[PDB]
Amino acid sequence: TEQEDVLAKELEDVNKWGLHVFRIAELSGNRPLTVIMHTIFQERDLLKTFKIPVDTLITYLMTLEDHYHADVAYHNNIHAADVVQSTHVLLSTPALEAVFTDLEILAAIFASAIHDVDHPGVSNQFLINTNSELALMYNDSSVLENHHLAVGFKLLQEENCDIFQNLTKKQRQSLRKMVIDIVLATDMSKHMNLLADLKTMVETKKVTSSGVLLLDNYSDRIQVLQNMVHCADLSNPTKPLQLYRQWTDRIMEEFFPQGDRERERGMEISPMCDKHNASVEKSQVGFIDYIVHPLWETWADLVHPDAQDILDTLEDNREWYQSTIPQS
Amino acid sequence: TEQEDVLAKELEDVNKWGLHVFRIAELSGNRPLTVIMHTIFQERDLLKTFKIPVDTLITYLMTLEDHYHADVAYHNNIHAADVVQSTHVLLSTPALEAVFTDLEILAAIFASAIHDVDHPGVSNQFLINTNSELALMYNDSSVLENHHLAVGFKLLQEENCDIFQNLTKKQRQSLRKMVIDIVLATDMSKHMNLLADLKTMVETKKVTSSGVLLLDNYSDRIQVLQNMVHCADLSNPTKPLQLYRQWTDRIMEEFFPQGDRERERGMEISPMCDKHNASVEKSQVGFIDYIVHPLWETWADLVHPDAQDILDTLEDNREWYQSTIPQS
Amino acid sequence: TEQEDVLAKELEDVNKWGLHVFRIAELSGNRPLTVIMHTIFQERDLLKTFKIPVDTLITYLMTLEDHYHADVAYHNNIHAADVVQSTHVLLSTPALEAVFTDLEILAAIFASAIHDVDHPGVSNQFLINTNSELALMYNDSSVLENHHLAVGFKLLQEENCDIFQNLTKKQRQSLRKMVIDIVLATDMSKHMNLLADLKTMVETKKVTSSGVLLLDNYSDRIQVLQNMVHCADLSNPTKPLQLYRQWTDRIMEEFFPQGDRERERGMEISPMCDKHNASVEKSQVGFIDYIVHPLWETWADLVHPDAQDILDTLEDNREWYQSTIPQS
Amino acid sequence: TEQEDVLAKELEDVNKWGLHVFRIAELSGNRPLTVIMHTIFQERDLLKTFKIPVDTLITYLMTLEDHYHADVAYHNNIHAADVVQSTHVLLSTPALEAVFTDLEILAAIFASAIHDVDHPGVSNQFLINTNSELALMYNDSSVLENHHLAVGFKLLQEENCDIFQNLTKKQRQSLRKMVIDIVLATDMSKHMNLLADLKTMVETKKVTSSGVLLLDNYSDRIQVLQNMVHCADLSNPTKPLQLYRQWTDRIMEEFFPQGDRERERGMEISPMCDKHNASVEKSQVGFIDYIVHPLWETWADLVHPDAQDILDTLEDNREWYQSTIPQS
Amino acid sequence: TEQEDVLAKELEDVNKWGLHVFRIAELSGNRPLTVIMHTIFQERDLLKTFKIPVDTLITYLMTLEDHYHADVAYHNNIHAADVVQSTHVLLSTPALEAVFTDLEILAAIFASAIHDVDHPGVSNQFLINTNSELALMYNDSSVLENHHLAVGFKLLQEENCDIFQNLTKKQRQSLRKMVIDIVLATDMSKHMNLLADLKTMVETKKVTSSGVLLLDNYSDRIQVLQNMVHCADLSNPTKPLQLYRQWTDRIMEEFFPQGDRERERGMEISPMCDKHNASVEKSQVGFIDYIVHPLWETWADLVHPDAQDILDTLEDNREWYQSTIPQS
Amino acid sequence: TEQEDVLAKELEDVNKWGLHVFRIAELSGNRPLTVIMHTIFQERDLLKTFKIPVDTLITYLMTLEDHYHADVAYHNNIHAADVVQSTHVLLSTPALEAVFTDLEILAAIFASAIHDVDHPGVSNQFLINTNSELALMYNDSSVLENHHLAVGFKLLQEENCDIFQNLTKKQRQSLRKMVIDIVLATDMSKHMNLLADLKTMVETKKVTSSGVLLLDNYSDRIQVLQNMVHCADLSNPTKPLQLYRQWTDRIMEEFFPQGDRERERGMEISPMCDKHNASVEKSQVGFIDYIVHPLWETWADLVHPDAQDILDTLEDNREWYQSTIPQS
Numbered sequence A, B, C, D, E, F: 001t002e003q004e005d006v007l008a009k010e011l012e013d014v015n016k017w018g019l020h021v022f023r024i025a026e027l028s029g030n031r032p033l034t035v036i037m038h039t040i041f042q043e044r045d046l047l048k049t050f051k052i053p054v055d056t057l058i059t060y061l062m063t064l065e066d067h068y069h070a071d072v073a074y075h076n077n078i079h080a081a082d083v084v085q086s087t088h089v090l091l092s093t094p095a096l097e098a099v100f101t102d103l104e105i106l107a108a109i110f111a112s113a114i115h116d117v118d119h120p121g122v123s124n125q126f127l128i129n130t131n132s133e134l135a136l137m138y139n140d141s142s143v144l145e146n147h148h149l150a151v152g153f154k155l156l157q158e159e160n161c162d163i164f165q166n167l168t169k170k171q172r173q174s175l176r177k178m179v180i181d182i183v184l185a186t187d188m189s190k191h192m193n194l195l196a197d198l199k200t201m202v203e204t205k206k207v208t209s210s211g212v213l214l215l216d217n218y219s220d221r222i223q224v225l226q227n228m229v230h231c232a233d234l235s236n237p238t239k240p241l242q243l244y245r246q247w248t249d250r251i252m253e254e255f256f257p258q259g260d261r262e263r264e265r266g267m268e269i270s271p272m273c274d275k276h277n278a279s280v281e282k283s284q285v286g287f288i289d290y291i292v293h294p295l296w297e298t299w300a301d302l303v304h305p306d307a308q309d310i311l312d313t314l315e316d317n318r319e320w321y322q323s324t325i326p327q328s
């Protein structure tokens, strides 16, 4: 147990934003998802609360993690582990003190864990344009996201892989509904609407004297959980620069093979996916300007100002990439 | 070619509302869909307009029809053939004179043809509650409707079953989009919204001096096509009583086995599906009062008054079933 | 003063809906507008209330009437006189008891009087398509309606033609605004919006215990006056059949010469304007179904049920024309 | 061809924001509009694309420019030339890459060119209050803007002045509609609504990965073109201070004669138009604070951040004028 | 115990719509409220469910009933008893099966019981116009309704008059809130808004397969309870004609003395309150047309079709009063 | 008349935002309300415009001021005087130039003057929870606000205390309505709705060329007056820091005795009212973040940018208090 001590030391920052997931990925023999999921369940005492057999949890996590493609640069088990950990941190934000039930917390975390499982490394648009079997199956509607959900739920049926075995029938139904609602919201084509509803909610925001939010009905809470996992899924630009840059390299490394795939097919090369005409820096600045910042700014509003540091980091990272943009 | 003359004589009423599809079903050796689809394509000169190889058309129709379950009382090839023929008639309504392009007409008719293919005879709710593989796959969202589309499109890939082989790439894309949008609208859980948008469209209705509707953009036209196939799908109570009654018998015959299936499962017997406590007459009156009449009344408004007779027949049939309701 | 007694006897029905304006037209030597306007001003004591010199009133009315084309079958001084009289009757509806100020009443009546002055007998669309100087002038926007207002106001500047000479500067400004707002609303291309706002107002309708409407702000009152003159302008189908039919003959007599004009120009013959392919009866049924009935039904709602008889007459006249529709 | 070289050298900055239009005005013998319009048409290859006879173009431009009053300090051919050039630059903004068709581009530029033709040097309000023939004509509604359109279109009818002679009938119709919609939007009384719709469009803003806007329907594109020409028309405070100040001098020089005109009429002197009580500096700061900055800030958002420099210049110029405000 | 048997026989119809409350009023020595409230509490087992001391209940009911003025023709203990009984019946409608908790049922019934207590026989408007101490107190806002609530709650404080003595502190708080919300909704000036929200709720209506409504949150349920007691309060025209007519006589008998009071004050006589110019028949037809029918029609929709008979009766009674309208 | 000169010198800043009301309170022998009200009435020539007997005005002001509790740290005559003066300044904002009638101006100022009269120093919630007679009276609805109105109007009835004695009956009615509507809007529980309507009004904002707002109907104007007095009532954090801090000390000094009162009652100590656990600085930052800034930001928008300085001051004061927040 040499470096196993270093691993355990790294996992001590599970509640901190910039957790170094990449190191944990190595120190765990490529099991960041299993490791992090397990430690978060311990941390949240979910194992006890829902009577989840530890052996069952690990058996499931192992299978789930196995279904994340190793030959995929970005959408893999490290990404999954990252979104899980980020959702974990966001759930603990002060403004959301005791707002969510244990079942809702469980759903959000489980949803994060499976949100991209079995991702092939190509976009929904690619799958649609190449007339993939997956697109045929899902009628070009949230092709990947639907698939992720199917796979994640399917794996629960195997050998004591069913970590939810001891939840009441009603609880199992709720969890399935919430998980489906959250993961389907990670589809980027739903970003605008999601953000719109979030803004509508930031106004008409009901807060208790202390500072905690007041979410009465389900549709209000599920909306927050959706945007939360969405923020977690799009949190790379808000993490410490060293991490962010690694992610950017991975996502570009994945976009290019798709562009290559498209060049072979004779297809119109998707934007950013063109190896010979990419502006990595500009793309990041744009990605932040059009998607990430608008979203996080709104989130920062809702949980004001618990997200103030994250927002600041985002804006700093934008300037860094901005400066890196070639001037010629 | 003895009764083959009678069949050809029956098909002469392909443009009339009360076509006797059940007779055509027999006279064709249980090939009403293939027969009616083919005659409507001839009638509309679609074979020529889209260069569809006749042999290819029949090959596809045969396969498609084969995928409609024979042991299913209502959701089968006769129902499919009926919705196709009804859509065909509705498309020819005066108020919609030259409003739709040939591609849109093609899509609506093709959509009708595959709208319920491979239907198992149980409801989406049943599939969801019994944790079916199909519901797991489609995340309890338009489970059946999604499946119908997948199967119908999949069959096109086989042996010269691709009747669309000679459409431009752009046309193939539009047709697929429209077909998906139309079939997903046949999901009954979307009825209220669909009807709501239709009403919003009846007001603000733009008509030319002659009487023809003015549909400018796609979202306006696709909305009409959706409601149209939806009306066709829920057209039984508007057909001649002799036909309507046969349909009612079939739908109840199908509902009960589901109720039986549920009784075995130990599940709560769905309403109307309970063999020992059904009020067939009341159910029809209710079905007409809450769903069919509200929908057709609105449709009758949009195409006023081309649908006046259909509305009258509907109201007459309602009174007939009303009278039949036991008074004890 | 032989028949001058009959004329005075006819004018006794100035407050009744079916006034026989055509007879009054003859008995007055083609001065129905001057005659009816004068008698309504007397009737409403407007001459006193606004210190209008009787000689000035008649001088203006004469000039105004003179500017209505004699060679125009429908849009002439008899039509003007009719809309004036109808607005007069509508203003007296019980539901609008003391709702409007004398200035507003004056504006509505004056607006009616000039609403179609100097009408050339062709449609706005014709003027636009033929690149008329009038359309060039008004940028194809409410070409005729703008023109009517310009002419009607311009005539006031002449020889003691200024019947408003004794209104305060503020009153003159309000009257001009209201008149412009009402006449521009007679443009048929604004029918849908006008009707829409009227419906929105029928809901949220505030009525006093007795039954009188409650119109607080100007935009509410000007909206009612707009729709009122619009109803008056489209009141032919709601008058006694003998009158209605005469109007229908005149309007068709005017549409055809435009159609002839278009045939000469080599232009696409406008619908209904085609002498060799008109279905006068069908056109009326359509006109009532798509425009008149929807409007009057809404108006009948707002002033419920003071307009109940008018609505009934409208529906009876629809059936009459319906029956007259050739069955071959 | 001495200074004709300097002129050609100045025109080299036709694609740059701060083009020195005033110098070009002199170097061209007071033909900045003709010169700049011609060079922009060359630059955009519109002459070729729409088969416009060069002789016809110059003939029209000459006539158009002639109809701009020489004795009017601000609303003259230099202003027209300036709005044209600014629209030209705005059209080339990165965010609007290939968003507009050539016809739409043509419309926007042509609209800018005639947007103030035959402007008398007094406001719409003045024309209305003085009961001008123009106000009588247009019923106090966008009096000037309507007139500009009428004159600009009328001039096309003359001697090979019809630069649009080779556009299909459909194109001519679209161009006319767009031109009318754009110029009528230059009416300042429509600023609040226009800005409101623009803000509504900045949210719900659909952008492609690269950064280009996505405008699907016409009403979306015409709305952008409207606000664009409106921005161009109110672009003075955003230009280099040396230019801005010259414009401010001209506009104040024009406002005062109106104020003088009003003093003679015995009318209430309009604000800012009072020669003896004007605060030129304060007025500019106010003009920027209430109109210009709110508009440009919104525009900068829509095309973010292509307009960042323009916004900065605007804010700098505001501070300059702010400092100049007398402290006594 | 002679007629005490008849009384007990009458109370047997406590669950039926047309209960003869007037007879019960006599047979009980003018204690219809006490009698009917008690029998409804027994009927609903509320005494047990909330541990209400029977002696306490009667003590309170007696005091409450005593605070209803005997010299008031309509707004007295019989009216109170009627609204209570009607609310009781409406609560039992099939469509609202197990929708409300016992506390909510208690609140609705208690609210009905005190909804008009200590009513002086004059309108809020009268109280406002005469500068009553009550209007001064309540700032002309729901003057009477506020007063009713104050008195009804105040009486609970007396000698074992506190029938809620055994409810948890939380329950007492909820009941007070609901009661206040319901009674303040009986203010006629809030009718339009209440009806508006009810219509909005009829659309978007969520019903279970069986037919029962689905009311998730409180604001949805309290809205239904509000409209319910409002319907009960305006239920006279929906009751059997013999009853309805007696109510109409009483309400007119009360309106007139107010009209007399106003004639003495020298005040403008309120509409309908004028003894010498009333059209009792017309007033009822109007009352039904503008208030009662619109409300009940909407309610009938929400609980469709449990209220079908009530609606029919209402429409029959309208025609009766319509016919009675003098024709001279 | 020693310091009476200093007093008169202080009152010279009555039209300036940061007026030092506390000094004026001393220099006037604790009569800031009477003094400031009188000077504002002089300033606005209201005495003349409404024929208010000066002796009557002072008699009323003296009585009114007397009804503000001396033993109440915040909600007293100095607060009243402050809200009056602030409303006075806001009414004079450029953007609202001649928008309000003299009666509306009178109502707003009178409403401010009485808005908290006879305030006991405890919250509505306290009065409700302690079952106060006042809460019983007003059914827990705007308990204090209703009371303030009642007392302020009641005092007018006394000895020539009726300053409105010479207003027409109609004017008296309007003033009463507006005053009631404005004061009831000072209830903090209506803040969210009020702000919501204000935002809805900032969009769809209609402004004249010059910069002045356009408020057509009453409901629009009364809405602005409501939010105005609401802004005035919540203006402390927007005043110069020296003033703001004094107010903060007073409000906390008042909150604590309530908390003490609650500790004695054995009640749950209200937030912020707990003497032993208050974070005065944090509370202010929160108060500004959740209530004040959101409100003023919106107001600044409506009257843009007349309120720019006030907004800046608010944000500066927020940072000051933020810095003061203990870091341990």
Ligand SMILES: COc1cc(-c2ccc(=O)[nH]n2)ccc1OC(F)F
Pocket (backbone or CB within 6 Å): B188, B236, B237, B244, B247, B248, B249, B251, B283, B284, B287
């Ligand atoms: C209750 O009756 C009917 C119900 C349905 C029907 C179809 C889809 C569905 O989801 N629910 N009901 C279809 C037909 C019916 O009756 C008759 F027309 F055959």
Ligand SMILES: COc1cc(-c2ccc(=O)[nH]n2)ccc1OC(F)F
Pocket (backbone or CB within 6 Å): D188, D236, D237, D244, D247, D248, D249, D251, D283, D284, D287, F209
């Ligand atoms: C107050 O300043 C200016 C005002 C206008 C201007 C234009 C149209 C209008 O209606 N009102 N003002 C135009 C330019 C100005 O200043 C400078 F840019 F030249």
Ligand SMILES: COc1cc(-c2ccc(=O)[nH]n2)ccc1OC(F)F
Pocket (backbone or CB within 6 Å): E188, E236, E237, E244, E247, E248, E249, E251, E283, E284, E287
């Ligand atoms: C005009 O008739 C009626 C009016 C009311 C009634 C009640 C409250 C109110 O404010 N206005 N009218 C109540 C009953 C009536 O009639 C009959 F049902 F008794």
Ligand SMILES: COc1cc(-c2ccc(=O)[nH]n2)ccc1OC(F)F
Pocket (backbone or CB within 6 Å): F188, F236, F237, F244, F247, F248, F249, F251, F283, F284, F287
């Ligand atoms: C938390 O601070 C403050 C709170 C209030 C305040 C007023 C009414 C209310 O209901 N709640 N808080 C008023 C002023 C404050 O601070 C400062 F401006 F004096």
Ligand SMILES: [Mg+2]
Pocket (backbone or CB within 6 Å): D115, D116, D144, D145, D186, D187
């Ligand atoms: Mg202009």
Ligand SMILES: [Zn+2]
Pocket (backbone or CB within 6 Å): D079, D083, D115, D116, D186, D233
């Ligand atoms: Zn201009």
Ligand SMILES: [Zn+2]
Pocket (backbone or CB within 6 Å): E079, E083, E115, E116, E186, E233
């Ligand atoms: Zn009542």
Ligand SMILES: [Zn+2]
Pocket (backbone or CB within 6 Å): F079, F083, F115, F116, F186, F233
């Ligand atoms: Zn206050």
